[PDB]
Amino acid sequence: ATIGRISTGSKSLDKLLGGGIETQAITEVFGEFGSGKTQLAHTLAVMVQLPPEEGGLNGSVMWIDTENTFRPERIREIAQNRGLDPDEVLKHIAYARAFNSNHQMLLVQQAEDMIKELLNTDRPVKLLIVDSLTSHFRSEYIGALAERQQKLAKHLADLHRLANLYDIAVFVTNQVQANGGHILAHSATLRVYLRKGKGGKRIARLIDGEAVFSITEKGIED
């Protein structure tokens, strides 16, 4: 398949990304608590449902939530201010809460079943969100870094296999603050550092110019 791109909702961020986040790729956004990573996830879950003329892929979404941070009412607001029907947008997001890191790993295998089911339809899965990818692994493997890295590595390999095999954009969030961080090392296809700036602006930079945007009723925008 050719590489598809999903607009983020921000012209600035899209330019930094070469058009949007890519299918057949893992995009990792990392930054401190409150930097806006989950707002970007919510916005992408709407944008991907637009036609390509508007920066989408007519795609379905699968969302793995590790922190109980998915908000359907926020999806509704973004959809209504992106000219989409909110009920339809929500009906094309498959949602699951991961109870721990082992369940999170099983959910990725379960996602493949729904991906296969939708593959030849008019609304194939085009976006898989894992928010937050690292939170359970971090809490469960305190004092056991070597074992944590083994399990994360297999989890990321599973996500890569899905991105490439099924032409999906995988979007993952990672909280990194004071003294913290191996990030995801070099595993993601693309690492995006997100931070708060003056006056509530958000600033994004590729790791390995900068885009600036705001969180609004449209999700994010310039």
Q: Taking CB under 6 A as the rule, which mask of x and - marks residues 29-58 in contact with ligand D48? A: ------------------------------
Token pair of 17, please? Answer: 């990304």
CB of 87 to ligand D48, least distance (A): 18
Instruction: Please provide residue 22's backbone torsions phi and psi, each rounded to the nearest 5 degrees.
Output: -95, 145
CB of 173 to ligand D48, least distance (A): 15
The count of chain residues that interact with ligand D48, using the rule CB under 6 A, is 10
- Burial class of residue 213, CB neighbours in 10 A (0-12, 13-18, 19+): buried
Q: Are 131 and 70 in contact (CB under 8 A)?
A: yes
Stretch that binds ligand D48, among 60-68, 147-155, 177-185, 193-201 (CB under 6 A): 60-68
How crowded is residue 101: how many other Cβ atoms within 10 Å of its Cβ?
21
Q: For residue 217, which amino acid is it? A: E
The total of other beta-carbon atoms located within 10 Å of residue 166's CB is: 20
Considering beta carbons, is residue 110 or 216 the nearer one to ligand D48?
Answer: 110
* CB of 76 or CB of 97, closer to ligand D48: 97
Options 58, 69, 90, 96; binder of ligand D48; rule CB under 6 A: 96
- Smallest distance from ligand D48 to CB 104, Å: 9
Near ligand D48 by CB under 6 A: residue from 95, 164, 183, 189? 95
Q: Which of residues 113-152 bind ligand D48 (CB under 6 A)?
A: 114
Distance CA 77, CA 93 (A): 15
* Closer Cβ to ligand D48, 94 or 206, answer by number: 94
Which amino acid would we find at residue 162? L
Span near ligand D48 by CB under 6 A; candidates 11-19, 90-98, 144-152, 196-204: 90-98
Phi, psi of 196 (to 5 degrees): -75, 140
For residue 62, state whether it binds ligand D48 (rule: CB under 6 A).
yes
Question: Three-class SS string for 131-145?
Answer: ECCCHHHHHHCCCCH
Q: Does 105 interact with ligand D48 (rule: CB under 6 A)?
A: no
What's the distance, CA 142 to chain centroid?
Answer: 25
State yes or no: residue 90 binds ligand D48 (CB under 6 A): no
What is the rounded CA–CA span in Å between residue 74 and residue 56? Answer: 19
Q: Under the rule (CB under 6 A), what is the footprint of ligand D48? A: 62-64, 94-96, 107, 110-111, 114
